[PDB]
Amino acid sequence: DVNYKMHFRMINEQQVEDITIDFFYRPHTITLLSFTIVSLMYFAFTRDDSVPEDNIWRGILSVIFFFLIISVLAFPNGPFTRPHPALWRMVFGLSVLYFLFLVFLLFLNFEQVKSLMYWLDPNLRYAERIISHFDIFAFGHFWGWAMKALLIRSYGLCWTISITWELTELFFMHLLPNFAECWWDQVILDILLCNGGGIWLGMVVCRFLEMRTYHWASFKDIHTTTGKIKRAVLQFTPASWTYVRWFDPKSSFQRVAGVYLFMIIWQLTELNTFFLKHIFVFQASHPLSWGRILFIGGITAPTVRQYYAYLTDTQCKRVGTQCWVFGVIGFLEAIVCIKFGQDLFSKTQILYVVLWLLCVAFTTFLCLYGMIWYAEH
Amino acid sequence: DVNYKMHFRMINEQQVEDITIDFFYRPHTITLLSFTIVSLMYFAFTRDDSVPEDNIWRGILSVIFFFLIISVLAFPNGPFTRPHPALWRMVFGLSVLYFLFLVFLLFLNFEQVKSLMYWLDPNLRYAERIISHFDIFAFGHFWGWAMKALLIRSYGLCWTISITWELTELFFMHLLPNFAECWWDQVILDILLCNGGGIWLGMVVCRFLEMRTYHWASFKDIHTTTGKIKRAVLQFTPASWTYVRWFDPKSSFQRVAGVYLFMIIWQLTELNTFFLKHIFVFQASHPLSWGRILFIGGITAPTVRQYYAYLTDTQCKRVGTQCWVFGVIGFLEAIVCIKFGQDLFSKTQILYVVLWLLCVAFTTFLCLYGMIWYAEH
Ligand SMILES: CCCCCCCC/C=C/CCCCCCCC(=O)O[C@H](COC(=O)CCCCCCCCCCCCCCC)COP(=O)([O-])OCC[N+](C)(C)C
Ligand SMILES: CCCCCCCC/C=C/CCCCCCCC(=O)O[C@H](COC(=O)CCCCCCCCCCCCCCC)COP(=O)([O-])OCC[N+](C)(C)C
Ligand SMILES: CCCCCC(=O)OC[C@H](COP(=O)(O)OC[C@H](N)C(=O)O)OC(=O)CCCCC
Ligand SMILES: CCCCCC(=O)OC[C@H](COP(=O)(O)OC[C@H](N)C(=O)O)OC(=O)CCCCC
Ligand SMILES: CCCCCC(=O)OC[C@H](COP(=O)(O)OC[C@H](N)C(=O)O)OC(=O)CCCCC
Ligand SMILES: CCCCCC(=O)OC[C@H](COP(=O)(O)OC[C@H](N)C(=O)O)OC(=O)CCCCC
Ligand SMILES: CCCCCCCCCCCCCC
Ligand SMILES: CCCCCCCCCCCCCC
Ligand SMILES: CCCCCCCCCCCC
Ligand SMILES: [Ca+2]
Ligand SMILES: [Ca+2]
């Protein structure tokens, strides 16, 4: 029983090792208490508040900012400790804010959510060929799949969802009877170039990061100018890497069905992004579109590393809180999409979605046959 | 360095001892996730949302409830572990919610706060002798002072702050030139009877609880129904008691300054309770008054214990997060009172307030002389 509480404190709050510069790791939480009061003392007695709209906006920014200070003090930092554990406490603190925002949205009607997002941006109310198909949003697909394949560490898992989703996104063409988007982009250029190339780069890098010896010197010990610039930059790369193996030659039916739930919460999060963009109409260049994808992408890095630990390690006995909060966010967005988007469909095709998981299990099972038959042969 | 992190975890998250009924202490957080998702599914797909005000109110309620759940998952439980640590995690979560609400209020103007509190309760817009002076609010004063004296374990501190604050509240009579309240109440009945009796009862109970042997049996081991009822009721009393001694015969000036800061924040909280009520006009029977007083009294106990631990224990080296949040809440309430209440005073008497701390240091210094001279004599 000592192991459970000890093993959970590696998933939830990984601790720093070989602390040599103790300035960055020694809490000063009365210089934080004094800074918060003197900051708010300046924003109270000097800031003009004759504009009612600006008071509400600046109030939100301060509530969000001072919830990140609470996150640094109290929230767990996941399984990550670079560049600093406090970044991953503030990354977790934003997950709780987004989770509670989705809880609130579930009780408002459609007109109140539409009016809420016409307050964030008033403009929302009024709203050879290969080269053009690559743009700043192609880097989002490429570098998103490069990051995902880094922590999934499986060609089969990544290509099963890079293929099935881009087939699903092409099937959802009756939602879009206006834009003349050609099918070749979703099946050829996305699967092969953005997703296919991005997966390879994240798998080439991950292979490097697991054959790398992590002997970390101390920033004080180095006595060359180029050496300190080298060690400061490398503080933003992983300290170590865990060898990820999802299946085994003898994998329990609980392990097969834990990987299968992974490929369904994962493949649901690609369905929330598609629908949240269609129900609440905003373009891909709006900060609500790419800002949320960056945030969900940032939550994914410690969620994949906490789901893997719980799924495989036999002494964990608890799922980390960041993996918990990602679970509700992925599921609450679906309810928001179902509740608000009840008019964009007339004949609902959930048969495709029902067919969408049958061909995912049938393909995970082909991954099991691939591994088991390869070990013997 | 090992002791600091170990000693802080005895103040931030005290762990349970002699767990015999493991049902109450084994996390089931995927069941929590499923319950949250199904509850929100029901509230989304069955609740009528044609009334916007009801939508906003129920959204606030649900956000608070699920922040309580998040605090059960992630927030620390202070130095207390009875009846369950989760109650104190939820208490800390409510502390954080109130602190963020105070952060938000500092940017709104007076009219926006008035409109907000009229939204909370629309009625706010339209708003022999000894026996009558005793009511349920007298009971509130009595039991609050009983709890305070229980956690401070000092006649000197409690009586000093009681006398000083009642004198201050009597002095603040130019704020109230309409109600015909006299000095008799505040100087006699609110010192000798209510506060005096509460302090005496709290000190008697603390003396009992620090001479009590806490041999806790197991609810399963007892084989008499009366015994099981007895052990179930006693789960809501402290498991142990700490002998509290603020001063010493040889007390460092740091200890004297820490006790002085403790007393100053205590009297500041009393001032906040007075000024919030007189600025934002709500009567003493409104939930905004007594609910806030109950909430602050609930925050006070782990705050007092953690402040004592940090002040006296030499290996703590960090102040618990609940104490941090309590201090920031008190200071933010003071800032709110200063910012919004700038019209209820014309000639500001801070000389009395300046005189209010000089006579607290003098009275603390008489406590030091009392202890030191008593030990030799
Ligand atoms: C409606 C239309 C049609 C659609 C239908 C579709 C639905 C079809 C049905 C799908 C159901 C399939 C699941 C079946 C049960 C699986 C049991 C299982 O293996 O349990 C466990 C793992 O699984 C878990 O339960 C883990 C925690 C999950 C909850 C947190 C969510 C975080 C999400 C993060 C997602 C990240 C995404 C990243 C994105 C890139 C392991 O089993 P165990 O033996 O208990 O564990 C042993 C290990 N310990 C306990 C010893 C440590
Ligand atoms: C304007 C008009 C006139 C008005 C003027 C008035 C203003 C006049 C000026 C008043 C200020 C008086 C000087 C204060 C000096 C303090 C030095 C000191 O002793 O430090 C420390 C304690 O003190 C602290 O700093 C503790 C943490 C405080 C912050 C938490 C807030 C929550 C409090 C919750 C209050 C609860 C209330 C409950 C109510 C019932 C101890 O010193 P150290 O050696 O560092 O500690 C050794 C111990 N370790 C470190 C080894 C572990
Ligand atoms: C701005 C700082 C630039 C980087 C300067 C630099 O040298 O940083 C060193 C520190 C940690 O220094 P150590 O080598 O003792 O850490 C040992 C290490 N944990 C290990 O695993 O060996 O990193 C940070 O906290 C950086 C916080 C950045 C927050 C943005
Ligand atoms: C602001 C810039 C932040 C940039 C932060 C960055 O690049 O490194 C942060 C973490 C470092 O993780 P640790 O070395 O603490 O743990 C290591 C743990 N055992 C593991 O298995 O990784 O790496 C990842 O997220 C890896 C995915 C990369 C995601 C880009
Ligand atoms: C409703 C339950 C009635 C009480 C029934 C009862 O017998 O209590 C069960 C447990 C007692 O736990 P142990 O007896 O193993 O000791 C525990 C600890 N190690 C000690 O020895 O102190 O208490 C709770 O968690 C009660 C949670 C109440 C939450 C409201
Ligand atoms: C819902 C009803 C909750 C009622 C809860 C209750 O009465 O007990 C809760 C705590 C129990 O404290 P522990 O035994 O965990 O720690 C013991 C620690 N070493 C100490 O010093 O106390 O007691 C106090 O708050 C004591 C003040 C009383 C405040 C009323
Ligand atoms: C893991 C990092 C998460 C960061 C969240 C991204 C939010 C950015 C919002 C930017 C809005 C700018 C408007 C012009
Ligand atoms: C330590 C416990 C804190 C509980 C907070 C008290 C809030 C109660 C509000 C009740 C409102 C009822 C309106 C009729
Ligand atoms: C422990 C009891 C908490 C609730 C106190 C209710 C006070 C009601 C006051 C009504 C006066 C008219
Ligand atoms: Ca696509
Ligand atoms: Ca009084």
Curated annotation (Swiss-Prot), chains A, B:
Its EC number is 2.7.8.29. Belongs to the phosphatidyl serine synthase family. Residues 1-22, 81-89, 177-185, 277-288, 346-352 are cytoplasmic. It catalyses: a 1,2-diacyl-sn-glycero-3-phosphoethanolamine + L-serine = a 1,2-diacyl-sn-glycero-3-phospho-L-serine + ethanolamine; a 1,2-diacyl-sn-glycero-3-phosphocholine + L-serine = a 1,2-diacyl-sn-glycero-3-phospho-L-serine + choline. Changing residue 238 to S: In LMHD; does not affect protein levels; increases the rate of phosphatidylserine synthesis; profoundly impairs negative feedback enzyme regulation by phosphatidylserine. GO terms for biological process: phosphatidylserine biosynthetic process. It comes from Homo sapiens (Human). The chain crosses the membrane at residues 23-43, 60-80, 90-110, 156-176, 186-206, 256-276, 289-311, 325-345, 353-373. The chain holds residues 14 to 408 of 473 of the full protein. It is a multi-pass membrane protein. One of its GO terms (cellular component) is membrane. It is linked to Lenz-Majewski hyperostotic dwarfism: A syndrome of intellectual disability and multiple congenital anomalies that features generalized craniotubular hyperostosis. LMHD is characterized by the combination of sclerosing bone dysplasia, intellectual disability and distinct craniofacial, dental, cutaneous and distal limb anomalies. The progressive generalized hyperostosis associated with this syndrome affects the cranium, the vertebrae and the diaphyses of tubular bones, leading to severe growth restriction. Requires calcium ions. Inhibited by exogenous phosphatidylserine. Residues 44-59, 111-155, 207-255, 312-324 are lumenal. Keywords: Acetylation, Disease variant, Dwarfism, Endoplasmic reticulum, Intellectual disability, Lipid biosynthesis, Lipid metabolism, Membrane, Phospholipid biosynthesis, Phospholipid metabolism, Phosphoprotein, Transferase, Transmembrane, Transmembrane helix. It is found in: Endoplasmic reticulum membrane. Pathway: Phospholipid metabolism; phosphatidylserine biosynthesis. GO terms for molecular function: L-serine-phosphatidylcholine phosphatidyltransferase activity; L-serine-phosphatidylethanolamine phosphatidyltransferase activity; transferase activity. The keyword Transmembrane helix applies. Catalyzes a base-exchange reaction in which the polar head group of phosphatidylethanolamine (PE) or phosphatidylcholine (PC) is replaced by L-serine. Catalyzes mainly the conversion of phosphatidylcholine. Also converts, in vitro and to a lesser extent, phosphatidylethanolamine. It is an enzyme of class 2 (transferase). This is Phosphatidylserine synthase 1. Its main location: endoplasmic reticulum. Optimum pH for both PC and PE is between 7.0 and 7.5.
